[PDB]
Amino acid sequence: MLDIVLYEPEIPQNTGNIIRLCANTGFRLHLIEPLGFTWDDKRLRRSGLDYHEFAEIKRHKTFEAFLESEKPKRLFALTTKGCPAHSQVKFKLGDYLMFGPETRGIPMSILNEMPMEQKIRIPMTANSRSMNLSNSVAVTVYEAWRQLGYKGAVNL
Amino acid sequence: MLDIVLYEPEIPQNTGNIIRLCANTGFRLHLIEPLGFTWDDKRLRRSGLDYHEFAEIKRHKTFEAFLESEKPKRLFALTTKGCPAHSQVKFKLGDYLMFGPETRGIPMSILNEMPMEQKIRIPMTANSRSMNLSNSVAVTVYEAWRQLGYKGAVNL
Ligand SMILES: Nc1ncnc2c1ncn2[C@@H]1O[C@H](CSCC[C@H](N)C(=O)O)[C@@H](O)[C@H]1O
Ligand SMILES: Nc1ncnc2c1ncn2[C@@H]1O[C@H](CSCC[C@H](N)C(=O)O)[C@@H](O)[C@H]1O
């Protein structure tokens, strides 16, 4: 129902789990280059992924290009530096949820230009540093989908 | 705040992500043997895990042993065969959330003896088969923690 954006993702396995997640939820995936792997990389193919789970994915050469072609109504940045928690905001159609790379998170140059209410954190206990990227995306996507009533889900 | 139970988990990487998840959330982890890896396996150590993230983990030789030593107040089984969704139930202290193996899910012999209201599914779109185990656990744990007010979380 919403759009998920990975800013310069590095590890193919995480992205593979995220593509499966987006196909299982109906969320659309955007990737902002440079990526840490070839798009034709095995770690997304031999991985167990179905080719139909791809192609609904948009790749953007730069962040600027992404903003200019998508014109997100609202852009959220998931960052352990955020103040409101992911479940304390009210998602709406038109929202884009952006995540940073596994080894460094979203650039301060980008975060600096975003409103405080749109930089959100997933809660963690003391001395936690961050969570695995694919797990962060799963938690965020499912919290948004829960708020939006799980439109599109079907019983098996 | 709650207890997470992995029934015969097979792949070390998933369990590694789950141990990091439980340490980041304060949830307690239980593993029901046989596991698919040695407890002394590298895929949980060279993985980037901190030894303190372990030892709060309980290993059980059998499911029966687990029931007899833990006496869960309520035991939930996460299964794509469940009717209520994970966010449609009201978690409470004392709950144990159980997940099945990556290649087969929880045995019907166990599911058959559980009440319908305690076999829960995470929603998915048409023709979805299941989600990655560590992602399923993350989504469930964070939904429960959200309901319980994120007790124990701290801002970084
Ligand atoms: N607790 C949390 N809250 C919000 N986003 C999180 C998160 N844990 C991981 N993420 C997301 O997962 C991405 C990859 S984890 C990146 C490492 C992190 N920047 C660090 O300095 O340790 C992050 O950029 C973010 O989008
Ligand atoms: N949509 C969903 N709802 C509930 N639990 C799920 C799930 N997707 C994965 N899981 C959990 O992740 C575990 C490993 S996935 C296991 C494969 C699945 N039994 C199959 O037949 O395809 C499952 O046993 C369950 O505990």
Give CA–CA dist B74/B87, Å, rounded: 16
Distance, CA of A9 to chain centre: 10
How far, in Å, CA of A107 to CA of A94, rounded?
23
CA–CA dist A87, A141 (Å, integer): 11
Ligand 1: which of A120, A130, A131, A137 to mutate, most ligand atoms within 8 Å of CB? A130
C-beta pairs of A145-149 under 8 Å, 24+ apart in sequence: A145/A1, A145/A25, A145/A27, A145/B123, A146/B87, A146/B143, A147/A90, A147/A91, A148/A1, A148/A2, A148/A91, A148/A93
Q: Do residues A131 and B128 make contact, with C-beta atoms less than 8 angstroms apart? A: no
> In this structure, which topology does domain B1-156 adopt according to CATH?
Alpha/beta knot (3.40.1280)
Facing B26 at nearest CB: one of A23, A125, A132: A125
Q: Which A residues in the span 124-153 are in contact with B, Cβ-Cβ below 8 Å?
A: 124-126, 128, 131-132, 134-136, 138-139, 142-143, 145-146, 150, 152-153
Reduced 3-state DSSP string for A35-77: CCCCCCCHHHHCCCCCHHHCCCCEEECCHHHHHHHHCCCEEEE
Q: H or E element: which one contains A136?
A: helix A133-147
CB contact under 8 Å between A24 and B83, yes or no, is no
Enter the tokens of residue A70.
């998508």
Those of residues 42-101 in B touching chain A at CB distance below 8 A are 80-81, 83, 85, 87
Task: Retrieve residue B132's tokens.
Answer: 């990655």
User: Which chain B residue has the Cα nearest residue A26?
Assistant: B125
How many Cβ atoms are within 10 Å of B99's Cβ, its own excluded?
23
Breaks (C-N over 2.5 A) in chain A follow: none
Q: Are A21 and A114 in contact (CB under 8 A)?
A: no
**Experimental structure resolution, Å:** 1.7
Within chain A, strands assigned E span: 3-7, 28-32, 58-60, 74-78, 95-99, 119-120
CA B125, chain centre distance (Å): 22
Residue A146 sits at the vertex; the CA angle it makes with A145 and A150, to the nearest 5 degrees, is 60
For the sheet with A95-99, list strands across it: A58-60, A28-32, A3-7, A95-99, A74-78, A119-120
Preceding peptide of A9 cis, ω within 30° = no
Count CA atoms closer than 13 A to A66's CA, side-chain side. 25
Distance (Å, whole) CA A73 – CA A96: 8
A74, A84, A71: which is closest to A116 by C-alpha? A84
Contact (CB, 8 A) for A6 and A22: no
> Token pair 């899910």 is at which residue?
B105
